[PDB]
Structure formats: structure tokens, C-alpha cells
């Protein structure tokens with residue numbers, strides 16, 4: 001089996017992406033934020049959000065005694081882009097985002113006392129190939145595919161790189177970076193591929209080197225990160241995947257005025273200092289076609305597009 005679903009930015013800044021997901025029988029369609037940095041499928045259930053009502057689903061069953069963290073848990077039939085999983089744990093929680101669909105490793109799932117599997121892990125027992133791909137758009141819709149690689153969706157070849165599952169994330173090591181037309185610096189940067197995080201969070205050294213190339217940019221403790229004059233044209237940012245390179249255009253790094261009408265704009269590359277981990281969020285991922293390979297030895301692939 002395979003599935004293919006369109007994912008759409010929730011706003012003009014690409015602050016997050018929502019993907020329609022069918023839950024229950026008859027189907028209830030909820031717009032979920034696909035999050036490769038967490039491992040729970042949770043939904044608002046029975047300020048604008050569409051809710052899941054398990055009492056209206058003939059296939060819903062309470063997963064008795066199970067809670068997540070806190071709310072209850074049901075199992076039900078869940079379909080994404082034509083791909084159906086029966087007995088999926090759907091976690092019930094109390095305005096464009098109707099819930100989350102976690103796609104990190106199931107070891108991060110929060111259900112107690114019986115930990116539950118992600119939609120991807122459950123689907124693996126049917127997929128043509130144990131993979132899913134993220135093809136996020138810049139200020140435009142994109143695609144999540146399950147079970148196949150669309151060879152028309154990228155240019156050149158896919159460079160695969162090793163993944164550590166020790167922390168439950170799609171954790172990998174970038175081989176370096178460049179700012180604009182500058183020289184590429186070969187240096188190992190460990191981080192996670194996280195579709196549920198908006199921005200690119202990298203070590204302070206790297207981030208300072210980037211913003212130093214933008215006249216008037218500075219880190220503002222008041223605002224909570226790097227800001228830059230809205231009048232600026234931003235340089236691109238390149239990250240390494242093995243010997244390959246992914247180029248993030250400067251425009252992808254512009255997150256607009258810090259407050260309505262302000263001439264100070266918020267940067268899309270920020271320091272990870274304090275987070276405890278580097279995060280290749282949407283700003284980075286949307287510059288690439290990204291393969292989440294869930295084979296026995298998981299890996300991550302990146303192609304230009």
C-alpha cells in the first residue's frame with residue numbers, strides 16, 4: 001500500500017503545515033500537524049478547531065485505562081492520503097490546527113501504561129517500502145508520501161545519511177555550512193529533522209556567522225532571538241548532507257515583522273543554545289525533498305528540488 005496527502009501552510013509565513021487525516025467510521029476529517037519530532041497522534045475531541053467525536057464512530061474503542069501526557073486514548077481507523085491503519089491510537093485532548101500526527105520513533109510515545117505506536121510504525125506492515133517523504137512548500141502546498149519515493153519530485157540524486165535513534169528522533173549529523181556565496185565550512189553539526197518545528201536552530205557560532213552578513217541584524221533578548229531590518233535582502237544558507245549540499249534561499253529565512261507594521265523582522269535561523277539540541281525545522285526541510293527511511297537500520301535522505 002501507499003498514501004499521498006497534500007500539506008498546506010496555515011498562514012502566510014509557513015508557521016506550520018496542516019494535512020487532512022480521516023479518523024473513524026464514517027470518516028471525520030481533521031487537519032493535523034505532521035510532526036517528525038514527536039510520536040503521539042492527538043486530537044481535540046468531544047475556539048474554532050474541528051473535533052473528533054469517538055461516540056459517533058462505529059470503529060472507535062476506548063483504550064481502557066490508557067492516558068497520555070493528560071487525556072484519554074481511543075483506538076480507531078485512521079487514513080492518510082488513501083493509506084489506512086486500523087487500531088491506531090488516537091489520543092483525546094481538551095485554530096487551524098486540529099491536532100498532531102507524530103512521526104518520530106515510537107519510543108517517544110507518551111501513552112501509559114501501554115506505550116503506543118505511531119501511524120507510520122503501524123502502517124509499515126502494509127507499505128510497499130518502509131518509508132515516508134516530506135516535500136514541504138515555501139509559501140505553497142507540498143506533499144507527504146507514505147510507502148514510495150516520487151522520483152519526479154526532486155532533482156539529482158538522494159543523499160542518505162546515518163540516523164541515531166538513541167533519543168527517539170530522526171537525529172543525524174550535517175557535514176557543515178556556508179553563508180551566502182561564502183566558503184563552505186566542514187564541521188559536524190548533530191541535529192534532528194523536525195517537521196513540527198518552524199525554524200532552523202543551530203549552534204550560536206553558526207548563527208552569529210550568518211547574521212553578521214546582514215546589515216543591522218542583532219539578537220534581541222526583548223524579542224527572543226535574531227531580528228533584522230525589514231529592508232534587508234537575506235543571504236542564502238547552505239547545509240551539508242554527506243558530500244552533498246542543500247541551499248536554503250534567503251527569502252525562506254524571512255519571518256516578517258516582529259509586530260504588525262514594525263520595521264524589525266524576525267529571523268528564520270536562530271540559536272539552539274538552551275534547547276539542548278540543534279533542530280532542522282521547516283526552514284531547512286522545505287528547501288529539500290526529505291526521505292524518512294524506516295527500514296531496520298533507519299536513515300535520512302535529502303535531495304535538492
Ligand SMILES: O=C(Cc1cccc2ccccc12)O[C@H]1CNC[C@@H]1OC(=O)Cc1cccc2ccccc12
Nearest residue numbers: 033035036037038039100192194195196197275277279
Ligand atoms: O513534542 C511536540 C508536540 C507539541 C506539543 C505542544 C504544542 C505543539 C505545537 C506544534 C507542534 C508540536 C507540539 O512538539 C515538539 C516536537 N516537534 C515540534 C516541537 O518541538 C519544538 O517546539 C522545538 C523544541 C523546543 C525545545 C526543546 C526541544 C527538544 C527536542 C525537540 C524539539 C524541541
